[PDB]
Ligand binder design. Structure first.
Ligand SMILES: [Br-]
Ligand SMILES: [Br-]
Ligand SMILES: [Br-]
Ligand SMILES: [Br-]
Ligand SMILES: [Br-]
Ligand SMILES: [Br-]
Ligand SMILES: [Br-]
Ligand SMILES: [Br-]
Ligand SMILES: [Cu+2]
Ligand SMILES: [Cu+2]
Ligand SMILES: [K+]
Ligand SMILES: [K+]
Ligand code: NA
Ligand code: NA
Lengths: 621, 621
């Protein structure tokens, strides 16, 4: 069986037993993260050792631990006590969320703030939000959550329509104390509802949409073996799932004649951050590391056939751990299917008389997650021509505030008195490269304009240049859309039939990167988001661009610390980290529920093949 | 009958008859362009006057004429003789293309050049290409085509595999004279074939692709009336076709409650240019304006069901003129259909308990043209949420040359000895805007970064700014991907319920623009392509960014001449001209037939609606 297979319920049960038995899972303990470790470099020819990594919280205040377990052998390999003030706090527990609202509900300062605004405490929902690190000395080493209030008029009401501005609270979810309640002044609570299933708002549902039926009478063209191994139109890969990262692709390879050719060893979205750009002290601390602080995998939706995923769908149902180490299945959490993708190649030739058309298609691997008000879909695409693409789809309900009477340079008006603070959604794709194997390098390619003159008398010439990134200190790069800048990953020791190194070219969307001031806390904690492309030398323990414990960690962790090692990356085992994001100035059309917007990137073969790899695609019926 | 209906065969025949009756279409005359004119501003209530514009060429060398005819009234409205040396030659006639190879076959200089290379003239194809304007004074006022040679080994051979470098000829297609044959020396003619239907090159065809069936059991959701009027999911528009521009969209509007709200009055691709970046004298003159010089509409393919267009397809079969004024149908030249487009909106709310998912779809209107080795697809999309998008798809066989022994800074190697000169494919979308009517303005929107300090103590704030373009002199704009630059077209006299002007936001891909030296002929002739965005005041005779007559025409017409008028565009009837293109450094993967690559743009509503316009979409089955 493959060492890249999905974790089983039984494996999670075994982990639980090992911990309990070792005295590491007492009643005050909680599992904040649990996931299988990938195989070490060079092991496929050694006996498998399924290992799991676990972060263990203690609700009684004791120090948390990082533990590594071997389920194959039934042992604890390592258990280290964590100093959270130094290395960071553990991810937020799903169970700690409800705690903010409950604690506030009996706090005199909070109740006084609600009384001033004539709000029934029973109707006030509180969003349990990550704290970050600012000027509050007493917070260092404490697990803090901050809370913003929203009014829910009735059980099925959308509370996002009714933010309570001018009020914020801080809570210690371990000592269960309210550390601060800040009331900067009363703002009107927006009164219009945002109930998008209410006929009064939707009006009569349209009856004009006729069905579109998408079927595959002989079934799908892909095969799934060993639970999660996919083969499709020359492509080979394994679909992993981790509670923090979500869907992870392993061993992406392409079968070129009689050779299975590696392209990417591991692909994942290794972090994603949502920084807010409203300077009000009510929200100025607001930055959500959806991946690193909340763990997007654990909140993956069950995807419904015909609504979420359309066509001939093959599902995976990944298993994760709950807080106590019990296995929990996410039914139909991953969708797999192939889609038509228009014309692949076409030419009608006058001279030969040959008219030729071929159709394209893509393999899709997706999941969808919900984090409070946001919902994000993560889509990986494999195309017939060798192209690999990622796309994030952002939807959900916008995070809201009051709209100030005088207007705002940092907030949009969505409805009367209803504001939506400006923010970004910024992702980091970690691509552990393996172009024809692990000996890889990256070049930055810019188009080069040429001056009219000798050797270019008509002034029509243009060219391009490539710069090898040889050391990590030179490998922090920025976009330059104006010069058509891309990055090529190649294997200097593997050449195509024209004697050029095989390569793949990364095409970025060139959206803005992190907008915050460089001296800001968020710029330090999300340093990765300040630049478009980073290249590091592969290492076991360098997994996330923000480090292992993002919650309430002071800046510098992750990429900035990795890069500081200044390792050789010229013809070596390397990792590309691409930052890409949406900058969101919410529009009226985003309310009361927002239409999907998208961002992503793709990689196209660049002299990887000896000619088109789709000449053997047959004519369509 | 709608004044925006497609031209009928009868109308074209009637234009022929009116021209003949007027003495303007004798046996030496040829129609180089013929198209219906759009209704004048403010004519909606006035009765139908269908008028046609015609460019008439004379094969005896007399001066050509531009003529406008009223087919309704049976009259010549205007007829003027053209001085082509000044204002430009007429578009290339389909009949002139074949003249080049025919004449060269008997030219002693051409025969000697072929003999030097041991090539059989009977097997030498000549690509007949637009000439542009260079240092050859004898070409001024003459209709010239330039020819580049390719060997075709047998009737079904792809000649593009066998370019004959070091050789080019110039031909006067009216006097039937070879004006120049330039031979800069013998290059090896690449020997490998590029026959993508030959089993020896394709290998065994895949048997792994299972069928994807897309059907609509109740038929499509759009209706077609009056021949070309489309209504679909609140959208209303008319699909026109013009021999020069191809598919043209008219009267794009969206039904919002009771009101039919205009958005775009006319959308077209008003020019495209393909400049080559190889400084070899054999190709340094090489640029074509497929739209302006060749007329892309006339080379539209007939699109095959299940191959070119998949699903429930409604076709239009537009009619054009032949060279003598006889009508000719392009059977199935335009495909129209709707397609699923993933998730439209989705939110699973913990507090309300409501899980909500809706699906997206788009209406597609497309055609595909073939000119020489190139094949271009033009796709317009309308989305449920009010988004409008255009996409160009480039495929075909790349234009080849020899690959120089020492390598090249301006040409890629595709196969042994076979090169592909660098080039661009650049489009101009002309958007005659009508956001809620004709009173419009354009603002450039940039993200604004803020400095940490008073009022922004945590350094998280970010903002944006909008700059109104008030006069044509300040309306020639460039991309700035780094600052998230977009352009908003708004109506300052039509406000949403929040008292803000309704608008649409143009999102560009921010690809490189024209790379040629600003001193080059191509930079003058394709001036529009040097900047990303232009805004003009609407005028009847301002149709193309390159002017009416592009063939062998120097600078002096088109956008730079229009802009000089410095007209008020702040709350006026305005037109947006957006430049966007591909910069193509050909890859081995592009050979022997290239996979589709794409480029485009879209516009999204920006406070146009008072809330999401898709709340009335029903749950899918
Ligand atoms: Br315990
Ligand atoms: Br209340
Ligand atoms: Br999907
Ligand atoms: Br910090
Ligand atoms: Br005549
Ligand atoms: Br020959
Ligand atoms: Br289509
Ligand atoms: Br010129
Ligand atoms: Cu957002
Ligand atoms: Cu090209
Ligand atoms: K065991
Ligand atoms: K008539
Ligand atoms: Na690697
Ligand atoms: Na206009």
């Amino acid at each position: 069986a493959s060492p890249f297979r999905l974790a089983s319920a039984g494996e999670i049960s075994e982990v639980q037993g090992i911990l309990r038995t070792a005295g590491l899972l007492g009643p005050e303990k909680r599992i904040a993260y649990l996931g299988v470790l990938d195989p070490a470099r060079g092991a496929g020819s050694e006996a498998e050792d399924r290992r799991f990594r676990v972060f263990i919280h203690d609700v009684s205040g004791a120090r948390p631990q990082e533990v590594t377990v071997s389920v194959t052998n039934g042992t604890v390999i390592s258990a280290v006590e964590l100093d959270t003030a130094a290395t960071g706090e553990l991810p937020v527990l799903e169970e700690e969320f409800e705690v903010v609202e409950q604690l506030l509900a009996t706090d005199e300062r909070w109740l006084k703030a609600l009384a001033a605004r004539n709000l029934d405490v029973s109707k006030v929902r509180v969003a349990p939000l990550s704290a970050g690190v600012f000027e509050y000395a007493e917070e260092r080493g404490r697990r803090i959550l901050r809370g913003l209030a929203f009014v829910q008029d009735f059980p099925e009401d959308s509370a996002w329509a009714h933010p309570v501005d001018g009020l914020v609270a801080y809570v210690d979810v371990v000592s269960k104390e309210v550390t601060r309640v800040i009331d900067t002044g009363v703002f009107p609570v927006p009164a219009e509802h945002g109930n998008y299933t209410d006929p009064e708002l939707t009006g009569p549902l349209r009856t004009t949409q006729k069905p579109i039926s998408i079927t595959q009478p002989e079934g799908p063209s892909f095969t799934v073996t060993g639970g999660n191994h996919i083969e499709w139109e020359k492509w080979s890969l394994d679909v992993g799932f981790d509670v923090r990262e979500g869907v992870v692709l392993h061993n992406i390879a392409f079968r070129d004649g009689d050779r299975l050719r590696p392209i990417i060893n591991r692909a994942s979205i290794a972090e994603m951050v949502v920084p807010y750009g409203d300077p009000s002290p009510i929200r100025s601390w607001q930055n959500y590391f959806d991946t690193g602080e909340y763990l997007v995998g654990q909140y993956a939706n069950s995807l419904e056939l015909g609504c979420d995923c359309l066509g001939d769908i093959t599902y995976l149902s990944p298993v994760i751990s709950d807080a106590f180490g019990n296995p929990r299945e996410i039914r139909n959490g991953i969708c797999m299917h192939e889609e038509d993708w228009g014309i692949l190649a076409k030419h009608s030739d006058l001279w030969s008389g040959i008219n030729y058309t071929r159709r394209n298609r893509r393999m899709v691997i997706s999941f969808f997650t919900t984090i409070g008000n946001y919902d994000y879909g993560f889509y990986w695409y494999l195309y017939l021509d060798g192209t690999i693409e990622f796309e994030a789809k952002a939807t959900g309900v916008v995070f809201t505030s009051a709209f100030p009477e005088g207007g705002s340079d940092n907030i949009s008006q969505l409805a009367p008195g209803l504001g939506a603070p400006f923010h970004q959604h910024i992702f980091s794709a970690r691509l552990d490269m393996a172009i024809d194997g692990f000996t890889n390098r990256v070049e930055e390619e810019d188009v080069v304009r040429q001056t009219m003159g000798p050797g270019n008398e008509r002034g029509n010439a243009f060219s391009r240049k490539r710069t090898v990134l040889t050391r990590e200190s030179e490998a922090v790069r920025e976009a330059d859309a104006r010069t058509g800048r891309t990055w090529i990953i190649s294997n200097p020791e593997s050449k195509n039939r024209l004697n050029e190194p095989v390569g793949y070219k990364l095409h970025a969307h060139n959206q803005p990167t992190l907008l915050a001031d460089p001296g800001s806390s968020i710029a330090r904690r999300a340093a990765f988001a300040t630049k478009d492309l980073w290249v590091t030398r592969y290492a076991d323990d360098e997994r996330y661009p923000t480090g292992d414990f993002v919650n309430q960690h002071s800046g510098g962790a992750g990429l900035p610390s990795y890069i500081a090692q200044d390792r050789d990356i010229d013809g070596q085992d390397i990792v590309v980290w691409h930052t890409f994001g949406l900058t969101h100035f919410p529009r009226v059309e985003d309310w009361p529920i927002m239409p999907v917007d998208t961002v992503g990137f793709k990689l196209r073969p660049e002299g990887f093949f000896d000619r088109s790899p789709v000449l053997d695609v047959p004519a369509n019926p």
